[PDB]
A paper describes a structure:
The overall structure of [name] bromodomain comprises four α-helices connected by highly variable loops, such as BC and ZA loops. These two loops and their neighboring regions form a highly hydrophobic pocket, which is known to be the acetylated lysine binding pocket. [name] acts as an important mediator of transcriptional elongation through recruiting the positive transcription elongation factor complex (P-TEFb).
The ethoxy substituent in 8ab in the middle of the scaffold resulted in four-fold increased activity compared with 8ae, indicating the importance of size and position of functional groups on the benzooxepino[4,3,2-cd]isoindol-2(1H)-one scaffold in maintaining inhibitory activity. In this structural study, all five novel compounds formed a hydrogen bond with the amine group of Asn140 and oxygen atom of the carbonyl group in the core structure (benzooxepino[4,3,2-cd]isoindol-2(1H)-one) of the synthesized compounds. In contrast to 8ab structure, the structures of 8bc, 8bf, and 8be contain an ordered water molecule forming a water-mediated interaction between the side chain amine of Gln85 and oxygen atom of 6-ether at R4 position. In addition, these inhibitors form several hydrophobic interactions with Pro82, Leu92, Tyr139, and Ile146. The formation of π-stacking interaction between phenol ring of the core structure and indole group of Trp81 is also a remarkable feature of these inhibitors.
Residue numbers in the entry: 44 to 166
Write the structure that this text describes.
């Protein structure tokens, strides 16, 4: 396993916005409770899951546990930076797998719910 993505970085500037607060309180914390959220709640453990190929394929890993910690740390500058991490998480799953796979059906459902929730953000 590679080290997981950073959740703090002292030389990166922090920020808190209404949209970032919403991304934690509403978007992440609601998606977290979905029946399909469990594979996406922590970094992929390639040793545990017996996927020695995972990090040979996926070079920018991302997961909701990392995103949650970043939001709690005020790690992001703006909501778009956080949204990009969600999009990276979804696209990694499409890249690593193939259409119709159970894990892909899970990501597809979560992506739709994510888009529903971010369609309208606070001002
Ligand atoms: C059966 C293992 O389930 C787990 C799980 O278990 C604690 C924890 C994380 C994952 C996971 O499953 C899979 C797969 O399973 C065959 C196949 C592909 C992917 C994942 C996955 C998340 N991601 C992100 C994938 O791209």
């Amino acid at each position: 396993n590679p080290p997981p993505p950073e959740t703090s970085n002292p030389n990166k500037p922090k920020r808190q916005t209404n949209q970032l607060q919403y991304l934690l309180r509403v978007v992440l914390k609601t998606l977290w409770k979905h029946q399909f959220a469990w594979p996406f709640q922590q970094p992929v453990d390639a040793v545990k899951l017996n996927l020695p190929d995972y990090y040979k394929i996926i070079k920018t890993p991302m997961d909701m546990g990392t995103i949650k910690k970043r939001l709690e740390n005020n790690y992001y500058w703006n909501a778009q930076e956080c949204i990009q991490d969600f999009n990276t998480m979804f696209t990694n799953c499409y890249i690593y797998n193939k259409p119709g796979d159970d894990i892909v059906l899970m990501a597809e459902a979560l992506e739709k719910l994510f888009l529903q929730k971010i369609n309208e953000l606070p001002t």
